Design a protein around this ligand. Structure first.
Ligand SMILES: O=c1ccn([C@@H]2O[C@H](COP(=O)(O)OP(=O)(O)O)[C@@H](O)[C@H]2O)c(=O)[nH]1
Ligand SMILES: *[C@H]1O[C@H](CO)[C@H](O)[C@H](O)[C@H]1NC(C)=O
Ligand SMILES: [Mn+2]
Lengths: 14, 495
């Protein structure tokens, strides 16, 4: 169970 | 009784310092040495958009009661949270700060802060968890508006007024700042991308979603406009106290941490309110990688139980997609939910389908005949088109939970499908790369099946399994099925 994650996302585009 | 600038931070933080030579991360899962080096009123950069500076507020905004719960917080971080509220908020808007000490080991962590102007301390006689602690604080609150903050936050310039302004205008709005990042290693305060908002996958674990191109363009259209969001990025938010009460507070049977953001977000939207992110409001938060405290009962059992209570009340038949993602949750008892179901009925709330269509249409829903769905995972890697098209190879790539090139389904026709493309066994010789080709109904080269307790993917009618052993040399292959780490694949949802 992991805490709230730092705000990031994929570094590429679909 | 002391004004905050006169509070003796060195005496307070002093006894509880990390000992010389000892681990700065052990107690808090952030660097306490770096936290302790900072002044309680340390300057932080103003991360607000320039347009935020051109706003003026009425003096008659409703005051708030700020509720901060904590369990074994670092003294320096807890004090700095309190001081940031007191320093950066117009004092007339701070009715009180209620610290709910959730059975910390040392009661003095909270008790000593009670000497500060505005701060009142409530101590739980046993571990209650953040949901029940927040309810205790909200029940004690004198003001008409509630503000909830974590105990390792730093409020920025004019953070409060923009939130209060929204709620004063419409009590059914539940509003949050943009959450800035306080680095858990060096305690630098930085802004993240404002193109991110809260979301979740069908396992009901919070994630940050990247806005669509149209949402991003809209945001550039007015970078100070309130942003509607499907899911509160927990748990920093402002809510009218009476609305909080009317809508059913929190589910008191939820324990410790987890699930309550999901539950309140579904309840607020389905029952007629809204959730917003307010760009001109900025609060930094120490994000970490591990919880520093224990979960009585087990962190896995607790999270499942809380999440089931949310799913069983709010999600209607969509709860089955949660159980498809987390089949182990079917075994976890979740207690009586009649009080919450009665609440839902009393409030005349919309169905979960309405929430999906109107509030979170970006959440991909499985097709009614899909066999499996979501991402196809191997370790921390995911089946990935790598941006390729027909005739292209496929690969593995770190799972990012952003869908896109990692979105697949195992269809009713046994195809492994992304958009209009299907995994195709163009050459059955073991070791051959597979290819993306247009999906075709009766193509035997496009048929696959889950085997071995949904832990591998076999090409139908063969003894060939999907294998990543060829990933360095050009992509995924078919290989003779065998007991190989590189042949382990599991869909996130098994339907
Ligand atoms: O049993 C608990 C667990 C958490 N907290 C508090 O709830 C807030 C949110 O928890 P945390 O920051 O660990 O979660 P994260 O922000 O990392 O998701 C923090 O102020 C915690 O000190 C609490 O009072 N009792
Ligand atoms: C971005 O491209 C990489 C390959 O360069 C991956 O295919 C990744 O999955 C893509 N990101 C998204 C969100 O699809
Ligand atoms: Mn936190």
């Amino acid at each position: 169970t992991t805490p709230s994650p730092v705000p990031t996302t994929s570094t590429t585009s679909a | 009784k002391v004004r905050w600038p006169d509070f003796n931070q060195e005496a307070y933080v002093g006894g509880t310092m990390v000992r010389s030579g000892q681990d700065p991360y052990a107690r808090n899962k952030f660097n306490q040495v770096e936290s302790d080096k900072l002044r309680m009123d340390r300057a932080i950069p103003d991360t607000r958009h320039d347009q935020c500076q051109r706003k003026q507020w009425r003096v008659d905004l409703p005051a708030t009661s700020v509720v901060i719960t904590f369990h074994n917080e670092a003294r320096s971080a807890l004090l700095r949270t309190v001081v940031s509220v007191l320093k950066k908020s117009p004092p007339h808007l701070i009715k009180e700060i209620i610290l709910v000490d959730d059975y910390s080991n040392d009661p003095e962590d909270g008790a000593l802060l009670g000497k500060i102007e505005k701060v009142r301390v409530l101590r739980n006689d046993r571990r209650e968890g953040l949901m029940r602690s927040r309810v205790r604080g909200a029940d004690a609150a004198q003001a008409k508006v509630l503000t909830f903050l974590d105990s390792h936050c730093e409020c920025n310039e004019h953070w409060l007024e923009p939130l209060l302004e929204r709620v004063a205008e419409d009590r059914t709005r539940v509003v949050s700042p943009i959450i800035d990042v306080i680095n858990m290693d060096n305690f630098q305060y930085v802004g993240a991308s404002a193109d991110l908002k809260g979301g979740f996958d069908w396992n009901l674990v919070f994630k940050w979603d990247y806005m669509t191109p149209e949402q991003r363009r809209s945001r550039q259209g007015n970078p100070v406009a309130p942003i509607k969001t499907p899911m509160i990025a927990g748990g920093l938010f402002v809510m009218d106290k009476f609305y909080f009460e009317e809508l059913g507070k929190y589910d008191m049977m939820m324990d410790v941490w987890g699930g309550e953001n999901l539950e309140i977000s579904f309840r607020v939207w389905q029952c007629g309110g809204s959730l917003e992110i307010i760009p001109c409001s900025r609060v930094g938060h120490v994000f970490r990688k591990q919880h520093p405290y224990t979960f009585p009962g087990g962190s896995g059992t607790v999270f499942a139980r809380n999440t089931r209570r949310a799913a069983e009340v709010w999600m209607d038949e969509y709860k089955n997609f949660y159980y498809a993602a987390v089949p182990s949750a079917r075994n976890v008892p979740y207690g009586n939910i009649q009080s919450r179901l009665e609440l839902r009925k009393k409030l005349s709330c919309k169905p979960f389908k309405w929430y999906l269509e109107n509030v979170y249409p970006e959440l991909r829903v499985p097709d009614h005949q899909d066999i499996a769905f979501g991402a196809l995972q191997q370790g921390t890697n995911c089946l990935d088109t790598l941006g390729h098209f027909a005739d292209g190879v496929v690969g593995v790539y770190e799972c990012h939970n952003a869908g896109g090139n990692q979105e697949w389904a195992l269809t009713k026709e046994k195809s492994v499908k992304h958009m209009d493309l299907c995994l195709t066994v163009v050459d059955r010789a073991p070791g051959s790369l597979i290819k993306l080709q247009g999906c075709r109904e009766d193509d035997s080269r496009q048929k696959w099946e889950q085997i071995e307790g949904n832990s591998k993917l076999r090409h139908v009618g063969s003894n060939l399994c999907l294998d990543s052993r060829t990933a360095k040399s050009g992509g995924l292959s078919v290989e003779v099925c065998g007991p190989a780490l590189s042949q382990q694949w599991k869909f996130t949802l098994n339907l």
